[PDB]
């Protein structure tokens, strides 16, 4: 079961600033009243974060999962109904399902056939003075199901913050979270919160794209009021400050601005007056040039190798090879040889070196 | 048909070819010409057979 909800208003993906959010605990190591620098995939400070609505407007596009993704959903009147993970999402490869409910949560991992519009249905006011849930259409069939445990519920203007960080390292899917009240400020709140990890998943597969899941005939329909944030993580060093209780009360992006760089070098948040040496400066190359002599005659490897008459070992045939273009790829890729060993060089890099003089010793 | 060198006075230097067919002075007491159980031929043949 799946229905294509093709009715939506043409709105481009807006952007906004992710001020000081997205900091989690990179490791399960307690630290007391100390400042620590560790480099991993974090959310950049003062970075631009994608802006999505749900109005009329039903934003649900496929988005890549390149090296961790930050998800925050300032979504009062809960309609968020999980996430989609995998690389193909068409039952050919294993895919991940996460859902939510009032008192239940299911993490579902199977080779799932995902329809182009996967969503969970929610009917409206069936004369029972309450909303009930049914008619969920996220996949079609369960083909190869492997990892399917059930956890405990985690469901806690807008008044709830559901900042989640998803990281997949060595096949381990990591989920971090933090809930705190929000008082107005329609953008990301101006405050620092640390996302404690929730689960670790031994999926062991590749996740390249993701998708969000929301609640709910099909054509000409209006989405419930929602807004969720999508940011992309890249490897950048940080400087996390731990208090006596051991929680990260503040952090500094080691590559944000020169002041942050100096704080990162000094391993301190406050900086005394003076001049501080920092990381070096350089100009990176803009384009790569290659200059070889324009000789066109191919080297005589044909009769060098496929010669019918190979002499005796004490009369090894030494042939002079020079002033020709030698294509070693045809030798390397052809697996007809039982021993293709190079000592001072590598067989794969032979097609990038121009040699002074080459000897061939066939015997 | 594939012959190899077996007897020599020392190890040949790298990339050196030695095709001298002269009899090696294998034994402690030198013997010259032909061979007996001494001063044997420095070339032997591979028995390459399918």
């Amino acid at each position, epitope marked *: 079961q799946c229905v294509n909800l093709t009715t939506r208003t043409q709105l481009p993906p807006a952007y906004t600033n992710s001020f000081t959010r997205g900091v989690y605990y990179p490791d399960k190591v307690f630290r007391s009243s100390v400042l620590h620098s560790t480099q991993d995939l974090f959310l950049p400070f003062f970075s631009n974060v994608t802006w999505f609505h749900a109005i009329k407007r039903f934003d649900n596009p496929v988005l890549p999962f390149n090296d961790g993704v930050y998800f925050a959903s300032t979504e009062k009147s809960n309609i968020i109904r999980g996430w989609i993970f995998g690389t193909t999402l068409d039952s050919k490869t294993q895919s991940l399902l996460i859902v939510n409910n009032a008192t239940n949560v299911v993490i579902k991992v199977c080779e799932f056939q995902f329809c182009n519009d996967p969503f969970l249905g929610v009917y409206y006011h069936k004369n029972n003075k309450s909303w009930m849930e049914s008619e969920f259409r996220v996949y079609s069939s369960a083909n190869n199901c492997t990892f399917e445990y059930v956890s405990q519920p985690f469901l806690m203007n807008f008044k709830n913050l559901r900042e989640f960080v998803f990281k997949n390292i060595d096949g381990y899917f990591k989920i971090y979270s933090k809930h705190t009240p929000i008082n107005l400020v329609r953008d990301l709140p101006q405050g620092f919160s640390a996302l404690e990890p929730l689960v670790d998943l031994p999926i062991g597969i590749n996740i390249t794209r993701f998708q969000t899941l929301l609640a709910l005939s099909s054509s000409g329909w209006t989405a419930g009021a929602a807004a969720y944030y999508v940011g992309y993580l890249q490897p950048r060093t940080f400087l996390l400050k731990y208090n006596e209780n051991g929680t990260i009360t503040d952090a500094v992006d080691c590559a944000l601005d020169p002041l942050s760089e100096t704080k990162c070098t000094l391993k301190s948040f406050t900086v005394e007056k003076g001049i501080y040496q920092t990381s070096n400066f350089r100009v990176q190359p803009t384009e790569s040039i290659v200059r070889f002599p324009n000789i066109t005659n191919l080297c005589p490897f044909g009769e060098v190798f496929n010669a019918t*008459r190979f*002499a*005796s070992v*004490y*009369a*090894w*045939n*030494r*042939k002079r090879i020079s002033n020709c273009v030698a294509d070693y790829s045809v030798l390397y890729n052809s697996a007809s040889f039982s021993t293709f060993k190079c000592y001072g060089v590598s067989p794969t890099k032979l097609n990038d070196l121009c040699f002074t003089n080459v000897y061939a010793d066939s*015997f | *048909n594939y012959l190899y060198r077996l007897f020599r006075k020392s190890n040949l230097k790298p990339f050196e*070819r030695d*095709i*001298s*067919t*002269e*009899i090696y002075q294998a034994g402690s007491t030198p013997c010259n*010409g*032909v*061979e*007996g159980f001494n001063c044997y*031929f420095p*070339l032997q*043949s591979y*028995g390459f057979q399918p």
Partner: nanobody
Amino acid sequence: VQLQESGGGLVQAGGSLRLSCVASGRTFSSLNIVWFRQAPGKERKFVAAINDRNTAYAESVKGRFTISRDNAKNTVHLQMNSLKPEDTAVYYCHSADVNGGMDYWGKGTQVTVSS
């Protein structure tokens, strides 16, 4: 460029044969010859070699032969004396040049001898 070995006719025990290994080349004097022996279906062996200054025979043909050189012709020749019926083999002749190791192996000649 190549070597051809012709000869090895039908003779009697104790007779004399004249086998020549004419070589297609221009410096075969430098390419000293080596004579090899193969039994009819048994393991191979060598015979002789006139390596320029001196000579070297085998145990079966020790001194019984008169190896000869044709330097003015760039050809080699072996003289066969005191032939025996137990020497029924296929003599060879080969030469490898000093520069650019290479072989000019021949074909062979029968050494059938009656008893």
